[PDB]
Structure formats: C-alpha cells, structure tokens
Amino acid sequence: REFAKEIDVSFVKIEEVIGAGEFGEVYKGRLKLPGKREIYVAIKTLKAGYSEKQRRDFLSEASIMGQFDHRNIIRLEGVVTKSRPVMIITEFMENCALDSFLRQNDGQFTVIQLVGMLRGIAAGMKYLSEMNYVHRDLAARNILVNSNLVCKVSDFGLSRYLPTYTSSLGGKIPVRWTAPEAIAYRKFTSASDVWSYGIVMWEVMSFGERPYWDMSNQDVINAIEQDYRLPPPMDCPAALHQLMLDCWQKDRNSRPRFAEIVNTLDKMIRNPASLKTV
Numbered sequence: 681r682e683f684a685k686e687i688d689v690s691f692v693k694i695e696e697v698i699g700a701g702e703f704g705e706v707y708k709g710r711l712k713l714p715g716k717r718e719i720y721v722a723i724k725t726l727k728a729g730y731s732e733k734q735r736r737d738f739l740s741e742a743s744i745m746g747q748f749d750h751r752n753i754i755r756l757e758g759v760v761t762k763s764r765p766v767m768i769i770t771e772f773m774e775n776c777a778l779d780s781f782l783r784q785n786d787g788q789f790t791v792i793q794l795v796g797m798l799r800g801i802a803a804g805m806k807y808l809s810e811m812n813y814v815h816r817d818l819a820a821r822n823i824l825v826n827s828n829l830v831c832k833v834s835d836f837g838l839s840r841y842l843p844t845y846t847s848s849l850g851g852k853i854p855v856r857w858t859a860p861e862a863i864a865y866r867k868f869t870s871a872s873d874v875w876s877y878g879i880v881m882w883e884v885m886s887f888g889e890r891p892y893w894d895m896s897n898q899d900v901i902n903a904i905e906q907d908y909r910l911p912p913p914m915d916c917p918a919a920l921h922q923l924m925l926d927c928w929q930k931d932r933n934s935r936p937r938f939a940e941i942v943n944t945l946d947k948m949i950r951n952p953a954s955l956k957t958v
Contacts, residue, residue, distance in 0.1 A: 685746055687758035692769060694723060703727060703738045711757055711769060720772035721757050725765055735766065742768045744836045752804025754824060754834040774827045779820035782888035791955055794884050797831045799945040804833040805877060806938035809870040812842050816868050818876035819857045820883040844869050855897040860904050861932055871932035878927025885920060886913035917955040919948060
C-alpha cells in the first residue's frame with residue numbers, strides 16, 4: 681500500500697507526549713513541509729517491538745483517514761511508513777478530547793455554543809456515513825476539540841466500509857454508546873452510529889457526565905431492553921432531548937439519518953424559540 685500523504689521523517693520534529701494510544705503514545709510536534717510555514721501537529725506512534733499484525737492494524741487507520749477531507753473529521757497531515765518509526769500525523773487539537781474538555785470547563789459555555797459543537801459532530805458523521813463508513817466507536821472521548829470549539833471525529837480503528845457490518849467480536853465494543861441491535865447481533869449500520877450520536881448529545885449537554893453513571897454494562901443492556909432512556913440533562917431544551925430520544929428509537933429505521941440531524945440543528949441555531957422550552 682502507497683500513501684499519498686507519505687512524508688519524509690526529516691519534516692517532523694517530535695516534542696512532548698500529549699496522550700496514550702492503543703499502539704503507542706501521541707506526541708505534540710512540528711511539521712515543516714518544504715516551502716510551507718511550520719505547523720503544530722499531533723503524532724501517533726507505534727511502540728518499538730511491534731508485531732507485523734500490530735503494524736497493519738496501526739496503518740489501516742491511516743488508510744481510512746486518508747480517504748477523508750472534511751472540517752469535522754481529524755485531518756491527516758502526513759504518514760511515515762517507508763522510514764522508522766512509523767507515524768500518523770494529524771492537525772494539532774489544543775483542547776484535546778471532548779468529554780474531558782467539557783468536565784474541565786463545566787458551565788463555561790452557552791446552550792448555543794454546545795449546539796454548535798453538536799452540529800459540527802453531526803456534519804462530520806453525515807460525511808463519514810455518506811462515504812459508506814460505519815464508525816462503531818462514536819463517543820465524546822473520541823471527538824477532539826480545537827481552540828475555537830471546532831469538534832472533529834477521530835479514532836478510526838473500529839471503522840468499517842459498508843448496508844451492514846457484522847463483527848466477529850463482542851469484547852471490543854463500548855457498550856453504553858452502542859445501539860441494542862449492534863450489541864445483540866453485532867450488526868453495525870449508520871443507524872447504530874446515530875444511536876451513539878444521541879449518547880454524545882447527552883454527554884455534551886451534561887458537560888461530560890458518564891452515560892448511565894455508575895450502572896454496569898450488564899445493567900445498561902438490561903435497562904435499554906426494558907425501554908429505559910437517559911433523562912434530559914440539567915436545563916436541557918426539550919427539542920434537544922426530543923432529538924436524543926429520536927436517535928434512541930428501538931427500531932433503527934425510525935431513527936433520523938445524519939442529514940436530518942444536521943438540518944434540525946441548523947434550524948435550532950436560526951430559531952431561538954425552539955431552544956427555549958426545557
């Protein structure tokens with residue numbers, strides 16, 4: 681496999697560790713392409729002593745990422761595959777993961793600022809689903825935030841090209857974000873991603889509270905089966921909670937598509953009366 685965004689190792693300058701990934705750390709760095717202004721980047725690495733299987737799974741994320749060019753999808757700046765160490769280089773995201781950003785900034789943002797963050801996420805998901813992909817890991821922890829509150833879908837490891845994806849495993853899926861049919865049958869569609877989006881909406885409107893709080897994974901599966909749904913967060917507009925309930929419809933076919941979600945949010949942003957009743 682050849683990567684269009686392959687970069688020479690000399691173009692990257694690795695700085696401090698900013699996180700931990702499945703295969704190795706994520707660093708802050710600087711990318712200097714010839715004749716272009718230097719930029720800040722984030723660098724995903726693969727720990728030394730990796731197996732060939734680990735290298736393949738690591739680079740399969742870069743192959744998926746390299747197919748996307750959207751404002752609300754983490755941008756691939758470069759890939760290092762022909763030199764050592766192997767790296768995935770993306771645009772730097774100052775405010776890190778969405779869930780931890782919101783918890784560290786509880787009550788700092790207005791309803792309209794939060795709706796703007798949600799609109800960006802739904803826009804990135806509309807793009808991904810229309811490219812015929814299922815994410816399967818949509819959670820606030822897998823959304824990155826920049827300095828101007830622009831939210832971007834990241835973490836494409838579980839992503840699959842579709843329309844249903846039927847998985848071979850069950851111990852990899854994050855239960856409290858996963859649609860009941862995807863838990864029961866390992867059947868992932870864009871509609872199961874819509875379910876996850878509804879959970880992300882709840883995470884955002886509650887300033888990063890854990891979905892279903894302390895309830896075990898088993899308790900969550902059981903509650904969803906008995907038609908329980910998460911209550912509206914503190915001071916949440918009724919129209920936004922209604923949209924969450926629409927994303928959580930038992931029948932996947934009754935759920936809105938990402939194109940309808942974007943449209944609903946665009947109308948709310950333009951109609952202040954819609955975000956007024958709680």
